[PDB]
């Protein structure tokens, strides 16, 4: 990996509100699309925050 792919990869490995299909999808995207690693990371962060928000909704009911 280049530096961008490697930093996006490490963060994406750790995200607790991704499932393994999503995580593996973002990691394949980093491999396929190295010049957009920061974009891939942004998409993964948004999804992680949305699925974390869905947990707050479950807690609320």
């Amino acid at each position: 990996f280049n530096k961008d792919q490697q930093s996006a990869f490490y963060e994406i490995l750790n995200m607790p509100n991704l499932n393994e299909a999503q995580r593996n999808g973002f990691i394949q995207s980093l491999k396929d699309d190295p010049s957009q690693s920061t974009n891939v990371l942004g998409e993964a962060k948004k999804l992680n925050k949305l699925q974390k928000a869905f947990e707050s909704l479950k807690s609320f009911q």
Partner: protein, 109 residues
């Protein structure tokens, strides 16, 4: 509820309305805010997350902000369909869990 929202706002169609929530250092002061919408007689749904992002399929007439220990939700071009109870949600680092407001009822005339 750990978070403080004003219980009710009255409004008319086509106006803007802004509702707010007050928190403290270890909840809103440290964590991004979510908004939950409960339409009359419907289950609650996610409206907004990460302070200012729209949940999938939510109208771009909703916008949100977080500053210091406060957060706000603004509804533009108010519609009869917007009459609902709006609840704030965030993580609390002192309680180590989800905290919520008691809801703001928005009535539309």
């Amino acid at each position: 509820p750990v978070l403080t929202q004003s219980p009710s706002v009255s409004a008319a169609p086509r106006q803007r309305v802004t509702i707010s929530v007050s928190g403290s250092n270890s909840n809103i002061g440290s964590n991004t805010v979510n908004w939950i919408q409960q339409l009359p007689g419907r289950a609650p749904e996610l409206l907004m997350y990460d302070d200012d992002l729209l949940a999938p399929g939510v109208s771009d007439r909703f916008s949100g902000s977080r500053s210091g220990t406060s957060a706000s939700l603004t509804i533009s071009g108010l519609q009869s369909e917007d009459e609902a109870d709006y609840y704030a949600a965030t993580w609390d680092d002192s309680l180590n869990g989800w905290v919520f407001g008691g809801g703001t009822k928005v009535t539309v005339l």
